[PDB]
Design a protein around this ligand. Structure first.
Ligand SMILES: O=C(NC[C@H](O)CN1CCc2ccccc2C1)c1cc(NC2COC2)ncn1
Ligand SMILES: Nc1ncnc2c1ncn2[C@@H]1O[C@H](C[C@@H](N)CC[C@H](N)C(=O)O)[C@@H](O)[C@H]1O
Lengths: 310, 625
């Protein structure tokens, strides 16, 4: 167990992300009991997680971790319960995790963060109904947008365009953003007003295709220019909380749900694989960079599961 | 000082957090009782069987702190009115669970949002909880002045923000509240936590809300401007609303994070304290009226009952009623006896209902001011007060005053009067039966005799108020008609109400009454132009009286005598609230009725819809003769 690393990892695993060199990032929250906090973990040995003794680094955050993402190769950007967005920067030895900035700009829990294509900016989404654009270098809010009418569920930067991102909210709107326009947002999809949208993944190749999951367990594939629902499937029995495309040439889609199961689908949304290895909510999926058939899930059951995918 | 709390949606350690906010100056704290992000499953496995604990422990605070310092918040994910069946069911179960936990803890209040139009299921579940077990807890419905949809930045290229004004649309928020509390049958446990936005809505809204049961006002830090010294303050218009809310006596809740890093948090609060101790101080009236806000007092029997010594004592302190009577007697004397006659002419004055003597003394002071000569009779039917009078007569007044212990309608006067003086008036002028009394007494006034007072007029205005509608509802008793409480007028210091139209005259009486055949019965139709959307809950009653010439008394708000606490307004409720729309006319009809034994009012609303005729036959209320 490394220096400045907590002895105990809070039960509720919120996020799991592989760096390009193969190491695994973990976010966790204490969602019950006396202390309602959170922590950040680095695992250069992916198979060792979630074991606190066999990690490379680790740190306590003041409050819970609602979302996180890698920033480049050493930065870790965090959406906190405290309303703060924070940046933690990895040690040069990569054995300490150190706070870089912690700005209290939202008025309620920050629920979602995404890093923009350039890696110099980021966008956050909150229950305070706002969406915010950050200069990571200068540690400030550049823009604050109140487009929505209910809490913001998810925000996802386009793979390649530094001013384009998707967002979705409990006001039933999926907004396509482009900050070059005087009126930055545009209402999309949901061709007939449907069930609330709960998760978003851009296509990693066709920068104009995305998928969205809804509260009723349906994953749908959208074309931006066509604006008709190209295909959809009832993949889950409950809310779809995350969608993650594989690094593959022909990319597979990992779908995760509050029904506690993981699914994997081809480009036409057909079921290829399904794991009920979890016994509580599945919260993140991350595809191995080193082995494109390995996939890692975390849940509130505190299980870190590694899947093999055809 | 102001009583205030911190809204928080993040609490890592309950003990530390409570301490920080305590130090900053807050009186209480609004916080989740379960972790806001901790979605629970109740039906399908395996998540149904998530090992506990479900939340943190009651042991973390003393019972006393739970009861006094904490307000619970419902979990933001609880959506009883979702379109998805599974979400509805889980939200029901979770809602029950969180409410049961607050009741278990003994929390004094618990916040739930109204943040959309449909809250039918939320209301149903809350109503079910209210009618299960025994607890006193308040429920604060968090509702905004301006709906979130109507506050959004105009930044969606293909969904513009429709800039053309909707008179109705901008009141959608009040209709959310109104539907909700209607489904819940006006439960006295369901109050409003009103959220103020950066852009205040149009004025028209704010007026109504102030008739509603507002227990708290929520101020987000983001609505605060920042001054010369970099401190948080509020716009002139936000100050107005704050001052209204203070007059109402709500609790203030600061929500959101610190948007002025250069200062401590308590700076927001310091500003509220600032505005508070910067109100105009209590005027003479408001000092005496201070404990009486919206307190209903049931009808008095002026003839059949006798006033208590302490009742006379409190009213004898009126700073204006007596000096106004002194002046009226002063003017009348001068006019009745010219200068050359100032010693040949001794005027006969009769105080009819002399109580413990203040109008006898006022009479004497009026003569020793006009330099004229008077003989006084003091008539009083309350034999207990007659005790005070007769001791006054022996120790002080001497033979100038003749105390008579009887009813003025019964007394055989030894001689006729130049002037009869009386103060027999109720809040609705004639509801202590001043007419009947002076009618029966007038036979002993001289043919050119003056009556002080000379006349009085009653006034009515329609009003809106859930708080008062509930107060009345709560006056149901065993062993009488279950709706009798709605069929009688109450004297009340109306406070949490909205006046829907300007007062209009109702009944008028003149004294003496040289009507060939005297008839005190009355029927009057009133038409009240209303210019907001609202709910009619009853009619405020007021009066005005001419004592003599320009010397008057009034509780009509427009012409209210200064400092005169002696009469509060009266309230005539209606059995059923009636919806009124902007532009509509309220038509009410009042009758004064009587027989040889008693006098009563009956009333009915006939536009925009009819009510039941109230109090037919005097079945629920009469005043005995
Ligand atoms: O309007 C009220 N009662 C209706 C009665 O006709 C008032 N008159 C007023 C003059 C008077 C004088 C002597 C004896 C009795 C009375 C009763 C009322 C006002 C109030 N004022 C508070 C006492 O301190 C302010 N409290 C409770 N009731
Ligand atoms: N019909 C009546 N005959 C004689 N006394 C009456 C009659 N009706 C009411 N009173 C008395 O008139 C008084 C009315 C009071 N509001 C006035 C009290 C006193 N004059 C004062 O102004 O302080 C009460 O003390 C009643 O008991």
């Amino acid at each position: 167990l490394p220096p400045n690393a907590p002895a105990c990892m809070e039960r509720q695993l919120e996020a799991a992300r592989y760096r390009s060199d193969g190491a695994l990032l973990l976010g966790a929250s204490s969602l019950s009991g006396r202390c309602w906090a959170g922590s950040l973990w680095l695992f250069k040995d992916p198979c060792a997680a979630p074991n606190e003794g066999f990690c490379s680094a680790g740190v306590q955050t003041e409050a819970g971790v609602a979302d996180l993402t890698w920033v480049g190769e050493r930065g870790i950007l965090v959406a906190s319960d405290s309303g703060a967005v924070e940046l933690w920067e990895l040690d040069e030895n990569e054995t300490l995790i150190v706070s870089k900035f912690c700005k209290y700009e939202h008025d309620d829990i920050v629920s979602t963060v995404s890093v923009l294509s350039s890696g110099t900016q980021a966008v956050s989404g909150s229950k305070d109904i706002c969406i915010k654009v950050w200069d990571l270098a200068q540690q400030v809010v550049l823009s604050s947008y109140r487009a929505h009418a209910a809490q913001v569920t998810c925000v996802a930067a386009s793979p390649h365009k530094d001013s384009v991102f998707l967002s979705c909210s409990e006001d039933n709107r999926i907004l396509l953003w482009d900050t070059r326009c005087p009126k930055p947002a545009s209402q999309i999809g949901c061709s007939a007003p449907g069930y609330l949208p709960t998760s978003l993944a851009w296509h990693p190749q066709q920068s104009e295709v995305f998928v969205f999951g809804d509260e009723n367990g349906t994953v749908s594939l959208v074309d931006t220019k066509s604006t008709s629902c190209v295909l959809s499937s009832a993949v889950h029995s409950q809310c779809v909380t995350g969608l993650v495309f594989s690094p593959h040439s022909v990319p597979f889609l990992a779908s995760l749900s509050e029904d506690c199961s993981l699914a994997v689908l081809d480009s036409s949304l057909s079921e290829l694989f399904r794991s009920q290895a979890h016994r509580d909510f599945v919260r993140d999926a991350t595809w191995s960079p080193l082995n494109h058939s390995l996939l890692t899930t975390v849940g509130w059951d505190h299980q870190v599961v590694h899947h093999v995918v055809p | 000082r102001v009583s205030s709390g911190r809204d928080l949606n993040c609490v890592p350690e309950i003990a530390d957090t409570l301490g920080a906010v305590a130090k900053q100056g807050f009186d209480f704290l609004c916080m989740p009782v379960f972790h806001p992000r901790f979605k629970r499953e109740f039906i399908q496995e395996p998540a149904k069987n998530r090992p506990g604990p479900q939340t943190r422990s009651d042991l973390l605070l003393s019972g006393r702190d739970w009861n006094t310092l904490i307000v619970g918040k419902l979990s933001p994910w609880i959506r009883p009115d979702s379109k998805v069946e599974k979400i509805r069911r889980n939200s029901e179960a979770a809602m029950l669970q969180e409410l049961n936990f607050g009741a278990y803890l003994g929390l004094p209040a618990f916040l739930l949002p109204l943040n959309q139009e449909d809250n039918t299921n939320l209301a149903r579940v809350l109503t079910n909880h209210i009618h299960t077990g025994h607890h006193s807890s308040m429920f604060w419905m968090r509702v905004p002045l301006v709906a979130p949809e109507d506050l959004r930045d105009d930044i969606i290229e293909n969904a513009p923000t429709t800039h053309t004004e909707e008179y109705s649309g901008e009141e959608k928020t009040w209709m959310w509240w109104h539907n909700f509390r209607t489904l819940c049958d006006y439960s006295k446990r369901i109050a409003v936590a009103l959220e103020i936005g950066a852009d205040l809505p149009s004025n028209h809204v704010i007026d109504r809300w102030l008739g509603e049961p507002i227990k708290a006002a929520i101020l987000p830090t983001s609505i605060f401007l920042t001054n010369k010294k970099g401190f948080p303050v509020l716009s002139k218009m936000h100050q107005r609303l704050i001052f209204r809310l203070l007059k109402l006596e709500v609790q203030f809740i600061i929500t959101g994070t610190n948007h002025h890093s250069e200062k401590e948090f308590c700076s927001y609060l310091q500003y509220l304290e600032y505005l508070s101790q910067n109100r105009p101080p209590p005027n003479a009236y408001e000092l005496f009226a201070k404990g009486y806000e919206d307190y209903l007092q049931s009808p008095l029997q002026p003839l059949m009952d006798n006033l208590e010594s302490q009742t006379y004592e409190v009213f004898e302190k009126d700073p204006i009623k007596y000096s106004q009577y002194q002046q009226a007697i002063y003017k009348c004397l001068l006019d009745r006896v010219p200068e050359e006659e100032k010693d040949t002419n001794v005027q006969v004055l009769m105080v009819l209902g002399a109580g413990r003597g203040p109008l006898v003394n006022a009479s004497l002071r009026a003569a020793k001011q006009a330099d004229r000569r008077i003989k006084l009779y003091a008539v009083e039917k309350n034999p207990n007060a007659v005790v005070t009078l007769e001791n006054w007569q022996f120790e002080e007044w001497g033979s100038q005053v003749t105390v008579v212990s009887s009813d003025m309608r019964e007394w055989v006067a030894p001689e006729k009067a130049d002037i009869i003086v009386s103060e027999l008036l109720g809040s609705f002028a004639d509801n202590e039966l001043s007419p009947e009394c002076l009618d029966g007494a007038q036979h002993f006034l001289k043919d050119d005799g003056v009556s002080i007072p000379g006349e009085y007029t009653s006034f009515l205005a329609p009003i809106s108020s859930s708080k008062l509608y509930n107060e009345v509802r709560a006056c149901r008793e065993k062993d009488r008609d279950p709706e009798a409480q709605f069929e009688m007028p109450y004297v009340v210091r109306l406070h949490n109400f909205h006046q829907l139209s300007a007062p209009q005259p109702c009944f008028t009486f003149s004294h003496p009454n040289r009507d060939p055949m005297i008839d005190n019965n009355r029927y009057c139709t009133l038409e009240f132009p209303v210019e907001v959307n609202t709910v009619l809950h009853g009619f405020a009653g007021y009066f005005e009286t001419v004592l003599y010439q320009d010397i008057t008394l009034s509780i009509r708000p427009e012409t209210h005598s200064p400092g005169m606490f002696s009469w509060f307004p009266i309230l005539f409720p209606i059995k059923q609230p009636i919806t009124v729309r902007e532009g509509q006319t309220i038509c009410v009809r009042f009758w004064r009725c009587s027989n040889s034994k008693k006098v009563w009012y009956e009333w009915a609303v006939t536009a925009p819809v009819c009510s039941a005729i109230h109090n037919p036959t005097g079945r629920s209320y009469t005043i005995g003769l």
